[PDB]
Design a binder for these strands. Structure first.
Lengths: 422, 266
RNA sequence: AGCAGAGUGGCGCAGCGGAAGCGUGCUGGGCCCAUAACCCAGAGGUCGAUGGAUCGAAACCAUCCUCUGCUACCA
């Protein structure tokens, strides 16, 4: 099915299509297709069957040679082995996190359910690169360190200009685990070293310690509707709630709720909400049917929620625990937090605007990434280590793992620190 | 000849003539509502204001919605007006003549369908078919009584014009062949946008009963073109059957979604 | 993807079985000493395709082709 979740995370102007298909072969796609301007800004899915030929490449299903199509200038010829009915090692799953500075928040939601990351570095922009400072320290808080620094766009960028950047991005994430992350120089043009990289996504990224016997904690970050326009009356179905499960094996036919849910009718205050219970219609394994949803993987969990509950991606960051799920539904929230001394996620060649941020003031909205959830709320009483925020929607902490707090210092909320749920 | 039982236009008869050839003072234009009967225009009074041009690409063969000033039933001179015309807009008579060409052409073979055209016994051809409507009072009467005929499937073989061959080999196919009936198919949109988690099943439930009410009484095909939008294209041949297809759809959307407490738009 | 519109002279674009339309561009003459303004005449037709039901479709009627747009994406 899937046992791991590797994030394909990378900053602007490095290309996403030639590198994700090199490691997976299944393209990440959504609307506006009309695909993408520079790099993929959507939180897309990618799933594949990585294997070996007693050779650490990831071969194609035609596994005699690996003649890729990333350029016509030089013919990229790597030898992944030969034919002979390859042995299936494992099933690999990817979580394609957004890599622009504008979409930092949805990056934090999709990466909070994953198990691993790749750092896709362009050699084009500034060598003290801001998103490499952003993403890695964000990975450090979300209990992940499975990082492969993958310097992606150095094909026109010379070996001395590429030399400066991976040194200087590592110089600012010196308070972050990225020193156990190998820095792999590859080609987005010659599809090169993918026989070495897909070794590392097996080597550096094994199967994480994943709770199989626990309660199913699906956290949907992507909504899918099989009740598409062009359907009929006797073609009645549910809505597919497809996210990564971080805890507990999930079965077909399970009555699953969305535990943060919806506000009930005539809420004169803030505290009344009901989870939307739904029986699971099917479980997807990269092309294949199963009755089990082994967690630690991006699993298509088709549920019996309504067509409107999946006609848009409306379940971004929702704890879909089973019927009668334990974790509570908070609409006012007591947070403990720390504020990072660098305004992380934005830094130019003049080091703007990563200076020290003014403290949080009361009755000011701030994005909290609680568990893996995407919600915004104003703080009622703000202290140094005691934040009392009230949320516009009742949201569920799956567990008190981490929150990511951002302050609206510009057009988008920008990371000022992190914290935890008290 | 013509499907009018009357031969000639009357006084202040707004008539549709045919511009055959332009003549010395004007043009000897021939009526077509009444058979082929010639009338005249300018020198005297057809225009109202002065801009001093008549045509750029307008070649020949036009039709003029003109009002009879003088008619010579004996001598054969029909004086026509457009200067008097404040309300006699040309669009109404021509679209009536666009019918009345086909209303005539339906009723002038006939001569069980080949069709020929031409010719049967021309005056007796119309007393049996064309003028028997014009005999059937009133003149707004056979505006509908002829329309009762070429509403062909609503119904075919009802009220008289049981004359004369029998007529009925014409009345089945040659009405559909001469008119080539047009063109209405009425789309019927139902957009039901429920937003909770309860009433959205009632969208599917009123789609379920929407099939069933399209199965029981058999209106045609309540579809899903979108998860909120239920759009059917109702073909209409009886001029009232599209409302019965629509109102049985609206009755499901109003009540069955109210049973599970959802909202709708129709 | 299901959905809504058009296809027509170079263009604008008429039109519904007894019909390939005007409005513009387009060329020559007329008019004047000439221009402007203007008149006459010339040139411009797969009515997208397929065509059929047909006495004869452009129409009717369908289909597909093109454009316009949609739930906004549909494991």
């Amino acid at each position: 099915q899937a046992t791991i979740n590797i994030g394909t995370i990378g900053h602007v102007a490095h290309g996403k299509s030639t590198v994700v298909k090199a490691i997976s072969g299944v393209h990440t796609v959504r609307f506006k297709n009309e695909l993408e301007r520079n790099i993929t800004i959507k939180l897309g899915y990618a799933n594949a069957k990585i294997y070996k030929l007693d050779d650490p490449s990831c071969p194609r299903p035609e596994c005699y040679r690996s003649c890729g199509s990333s350029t016509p200038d030089e013919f990229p010829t790597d030898i992944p082995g030969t034919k002979g009915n390859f042995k299936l090692v494992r099933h690999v799953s990817f979580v394609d996190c957004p890599g622009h500075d504008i979409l930092m928040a949805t990056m934090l939601n999709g990466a909070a359910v994953m198990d691993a990351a790749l750092l896709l570095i362009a050699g084009n922009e500034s060598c003290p690169q801001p998103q490499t400072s952003e993403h890695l320290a964000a990975i450090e808080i979300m209990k992940l360190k499975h990082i492969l620094i993958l310097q992606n766009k150095i094909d026109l960028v010379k070996e001395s200009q590429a030399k400066e950047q991976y040194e200087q991005i590592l110089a600012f994430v010196q308070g972050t685990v990225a020193e156990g992350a190998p820095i792999i120089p590859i080609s987005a043009q010659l599809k090169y070293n993918i026989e070495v990289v897909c070794e590392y996504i097996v080597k550096k990224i094994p199967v994480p310690p994943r709770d199989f016997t626990s309660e199913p904690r699906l956290i949907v970050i992507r909504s899918f509707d099989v009740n598409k326009p062009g359907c009929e009356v006797d073609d009645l179905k549910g809505g597919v709630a497809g996210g990564s499960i971080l805890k507990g094996v999930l079965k077909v036919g399970q009555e699953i709720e969305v535990r943060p849910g919806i506000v009930s009718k005539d809420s004169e205050g803030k505290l009344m909400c009901k989870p939307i219970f739904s029986k699971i219609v099917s479980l997807f394994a990269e092309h294949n049917d199963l009755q089990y949803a082994a967690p630690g993987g991006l699993i298509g969990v088709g549920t019996k929620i309504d067509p409107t509950l999946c006609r848009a991606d409306r379940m971004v960051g929702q704890v879909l625990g089973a019927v009668g799920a334990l974790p509570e539904i908070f609409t006012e929230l007591e947070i403990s937090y720390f504020l990072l001394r660098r305004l992380l996620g934005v830094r130019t060649e003049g080091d703007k605007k990563a200076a020290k941020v003014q403290k949080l003031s009361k009755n000011e909205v701030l994005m909290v990434n609680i568990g893996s959830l995407s919600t915004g709320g104003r703080v009622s009483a703000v202290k140094a280590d005691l934040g009392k925020i009230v949320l516009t929607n009742p949201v569920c902490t799956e567990v008190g793992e981490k929150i990511a707090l951002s302050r609206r210092v510009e057009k988008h909320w920008r990371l000022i620190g992190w914290g935890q749920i008290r | 000849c013509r499907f009018y039982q009357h031969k000639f236009p009357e006084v202040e008869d707004v008539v549709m003539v045919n511009v055959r050839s332009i003549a010395e003072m004007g043009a000897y234009v021939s009526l077509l509502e009444y058979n082929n009967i010639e009338g005249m225009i300018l020198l005297s009074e057809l225009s109202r204001r002065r801009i001093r041009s008549i045509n750029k690409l307008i070649r020949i063969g036009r039709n003029e919605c003109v009002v009879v000033i003088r008619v010579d039933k004996e001598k054969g001179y029909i004086d026509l007006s457009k200067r008097r015309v404040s309300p006699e807009e040309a669009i109404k008579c021509e679209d009536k003549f666009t019918k009345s060409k086909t209303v005539y052409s339906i009723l002038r073979h006939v001569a069980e369908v080949l069709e020929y055209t031409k010719d049967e016994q021309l005056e007796s051809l119309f007393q049996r078919t064309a003028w028997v409507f014009d005999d059937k009072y009133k003149r707004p009467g056979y505006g509908a009584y002829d329309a009762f005929k070429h509403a062909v499937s609503d119904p075919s073989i009802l009220d008289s014009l049981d004359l004369n061959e029998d007529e009925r080999e014409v009345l089945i196919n040659n009405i559909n062949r001469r008119l080539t009936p047009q063109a209405v198919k009425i789309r019927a949109d139902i957009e039901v946008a429920c937003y909770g988690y309860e009433g959205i099943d009632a969208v599917k439930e009123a789609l379920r009963a929407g099939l069933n009410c399209s199965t029981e009484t058999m209106p045609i095909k309540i579809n899903l073109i979108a998860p909120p939008r239920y759009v059917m294209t109702t073909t209409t041949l009886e001029r009232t059957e599209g409302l019965s297809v629509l109102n049985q759809a609206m009755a499901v959307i109003k009540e069955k979604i109210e049973e599970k407490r959802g909202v709708f738009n129709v």
